[PDB]
């Protein structure tokens, strides 16, 4: 891709509330929510364990649309 997407900078445990340290930004294949998108993501809870590495996507957080 060349759009870069949210990706997770460490395990994040089901259920867990966002915050700035665990998520990076990286051009990954297939694209996730956007880079620019991390700040409004704080503070929104994950539904599922998201692993080191794994690309964040719109239904793996609770609330989010965009």
């Given at each position: 891709?060349?759009?870069?997407s ?48 794994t ?9 989010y649309?965009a």
């Amino acid at each position: 891709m060349a759009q870069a997407s949210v990706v997770a900078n460490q395990l994040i445990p089901i259920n867990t509330m966002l915050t700035l340290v665990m998520m990076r930004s990286e051009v990954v294949t297939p694209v996730g929510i956007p880079a620019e998108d991390i700040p409004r993501l704080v503070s929104m809870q994950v539904n599922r364990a998201v692993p080191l590495g794994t690309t964040l996507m719109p239904d793996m957080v609770k609330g989010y649309a965009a």
